[model samples]
Target chain A: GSHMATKARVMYDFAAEPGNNELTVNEGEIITITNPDVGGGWLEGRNIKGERGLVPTDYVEILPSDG
Target chain B: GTVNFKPTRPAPPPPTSGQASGASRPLPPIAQALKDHLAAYELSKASE
Candidate 1:
């Protein structure tokens, strides 16, 4: 059974552009991906700091499961 | 203190080009696995 939460680590720095549907994902920061809006070129995520919004999928690399 | 975050949902994508409308764009195996991981992660976070 899986017990760990899924995580995605930022690959580079990003800034939220509300007008452009983006989120702030600083390099090396880890965020919880809520959804990978596949085909949309974007994904929804939330950081531990509680910032949540859409970010470019290419900016993150999914962490392996310990689950 | 506990934080209440209303996670923003991604906007639906516009109709994809070069593909038939209504067709699903299945994610590759690795991508799908990742998606599953994230989905599980989100669930766990919600229960926290």
Candidate 2:
């Protein structure tokens, strides 16, 4: 449920316990993180980390060949 | 630089109203060419 959130964007803390527990948020510390660019927001923070991060916004999910 | 415009055709009388013949105003080729070239150069810079 993406409700009752303040001006901060929600993010999943990989270190959180249980599953989908959005209630235990880190308040304003919640940030939209990228794969390689941990704290890099978009646009204003476009070229974050190095080159192999965020997959552009046009990334397509690559299915495994043997799956 | 200052340029002179010499009439190629016969001179017309003083303009009594609008719409004068080409003979009244000759093409200032030197000044016109300079102006065109300058504008073209400026355009090239802007495009870059």
Candidate 3:
């Protein structure tokens, strides 16, 4: 895929809603932000489980992009 | 089914122009954070 994997840190826990393209995240968990594109209150990312889904942007802080 | 009904002697007046007041809405935290990040991202990219 052309998507770059950027590192990010989750600032809070989020329970993804069904059919919302969201994913669960936990506080202090480092995650791979596959897509920085955000909209409609969601940003796409991949969880530690290697499953990709949208995450609440407010609940996560984008770390320095190192690629 | 058929039923008998009677209209009230006087109907209530329609709503007036004035409406209830409340606090204005603000941007959600997620959107706010995202916007800030995007700005920073753009700046970094420009510096490149």
Q: Give a tens-digit lDDT track for model 2, residues A10-47.
A: 22221222331112332223222223222212111112
What is the CA-based DockQ of model 2? 0.00
Badly placed stretches (over 4 Å) of model 1 are: B1-48
Docking class of 3: incorrect
Alpha-carbon shift of residue B24 in model 3 (angstroms): 14
TM-score of each: 0.51, 0.14, 0.50
The model with the greater DockQ, 1 or 3, is: 1
CAPRI class assigned to model 1: incorrect
lDDT of 3 by residue, B1-48 (tens): 322222211111212324423222456765334566568666774443
A1-67 per-residue lDDT for model 3 (tens digits): 3544678887766665566555677888888866565444456676668877666565678886565
How would you encode candidate 1's per-residue C-alpha lDDT over B9-37 as one tens digit per residue? 33322322343333145677653335665
| C-alpha lDDT of residue B39 in model 2 | 81
TM-score of 1: 0.51
- Where is the poorest 10-residue window by lDDT in model 3 chain B? B5-14
